[PDB]
Amino acid sequence: VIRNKIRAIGKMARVFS
Amino acid sequence: VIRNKIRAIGKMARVFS
Amino acid sequence: QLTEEQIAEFKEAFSLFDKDGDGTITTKELGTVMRSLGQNPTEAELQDMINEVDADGNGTIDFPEFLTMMARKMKDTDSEEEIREAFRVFDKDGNGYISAAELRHVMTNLGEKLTDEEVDEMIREADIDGDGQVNYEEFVQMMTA
Amino acid sequence: QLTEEQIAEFKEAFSLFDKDGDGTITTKELGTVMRSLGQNPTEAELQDMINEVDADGNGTIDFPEFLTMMARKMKDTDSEEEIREAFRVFDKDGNGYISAAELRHVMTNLGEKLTDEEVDEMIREADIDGDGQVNYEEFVQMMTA
Ligand SMILES: [Ca+2]
Ligand SMILES: [Ca+2]
Ligand SMILES: [Ca+2]
Ligand SMILES: [Ca+2]
Ligand SMILES: [Ca+2]
Ligand SMILES: [Ca+2]
Ligand SMILES: [Ca+2]
Ligand SMILES: [Ca+2]
Ligand SMILES: [Ca+2]
Ligand SMILES: [Ca+2]
Ligand SMILES: [Ca+2]
């Protein structure tokens, strides 16, 4: 789940910049 | 259609480089 | 329909924002994620972000409003990235400006059949600041309207 | 399924490569585009690229093979970008290394409850070079594992 969280944040990082 | 081509170029740049 | 997988990705994203699990995203929650991403938005910026998608006027973001926000931002980000990449392809010397010669040589290499005069016209039209070459901001203008 | 607009985009992308319009992409053609993208592949490297997707073994790329190439490269690009952005999230000071302190902080942001021992374990497992920090390469390995 941790790795899922990490991927999720990376996705969001690109969308929100 | 120049702009469509430019967009394609950008897309390819992203996925190859 | 979205695939079940697609929907799952959006639910995951929603969950990342909805810190307290109540079904809505507040400015506090929004700000939390933004900060976690290394940004530092003002309270006014956060309110504005919500306002843009807050169809029901309750000052929070529910799931369908969040879809709108995501959709918009994903489209914009994708477009921005593509345009930026294309800029880089044309700006061969990496000086931050596309010249007529740069444009001409790339286009030709890539199989287009534009005359020298047509390339010059492309530059002329896009060069809205009048300095002779096309910078990134001008390139964006050219590509978006 | 596929939308008309999607297909249009893929046709435009294919045409960028298939300069002569013969419905196949050659090493020659592939190389020309790669150079415009700022690379400098050799013939053998270009042949390798084609071989990865050359379903019919004819030595060149047709439209369905190009679709496979794109599907793969899009997925890979996306994944790589996600991981890279995540790395930047973790590496708060921008020094190129994730410290145990940084990791602990981010795990707390993300609302993953960890004990001290757990964070250490996490670092220990990803830390190939024994420096007690996680560099990019290490992070990528941890994430593709
Ligand atoms: Ca909430
Ligand atoms: Ca409002
Ligand atoms: Ca609302
Ligand atoms: Ca230049
Ligand atoms: Ca003509
Ligand atoms: Ca004019
Ligand atoms: Ca200018
Ligand atoms: Ca061809
Ligand atoms: Ca083939
Ligand atoms: Ca660091
Ligand atoms: Ca290390």
Residue numbers in the entry:
A (entry chain K), B (entry chain L): 395 to 411
C (entry chain B), D (entry chain A): 3 to 147
Provide the publication's sentences verbatim.
Calmodulin (CaM) is a calcium-dependent regulatory protein, able to interact with a plethora of target proteins having diverse functions. CaM consists of N- and C-terminal lobes and a central helix. Upon calcium binding to the four EF-hands of CaM, a hydrophobic pocket opens in each of the two lobes of CaM, which then interact with large hydrophobic or aromatic residues from the target sequence. One example of a non-classical mode of CaM-peptide interaction has been suggested in the case of the calmodulin-binding domain (CBD) of calcineurin A (CnA).
Synchrotron X-ray diffraction data allowed us to solve and refine the structure of the complex at 1.45-Å resolution, much higher than previously obtained for the CaM-CnA-CBD complex (between 1.86 and 2.6 Å). The overall conformation of the CaM-CnA-CBD complex seen in the crystal is the same as in the earlier structures of this complex; most notably, the complex is formed by 2∶2 association, such that CaM forms an X-shaped dimer. The binding mode is somewhat unexpected; while the ‘1-10’ and ‘1-14’ modes are the most common for CaM ligands (the numbering originating from the relative positions in the primary sequence of large hydrophobic residues that bind to the two hydrophobic pockets of CaM), in the case of the CnA-CBD, the binding mode is ‘1-11’. The residues buried in the hydrophobic pockets are, namely, Ile400 and Phe410. At the middle of the X-shaped 2∶2 complex, between the two central helices, a network of salt bridges exists, formed by, for example, Arg408 from both peptides and Glu80 and Glu83 from both CaM molecules. The high resolution of the diffraction data allows the examination of the fine details of peptide recognition in the complex. It is notable that both of the hydrophobic pockets of CaM are relatively disordered, many of the Phe and Met residues being present in a double conformation despite the presence of bound peptide. Thus, it is possible that the 2∶2 complex is, at least partially, stabilized by the crystal contacts. Thus, it seems that in the CaM-CnA-CBD complex, CaM is mostly in the unliganded conformation up to residue 90, after which the C-terminal lobe has turned approximately 25° upon peptide binding.
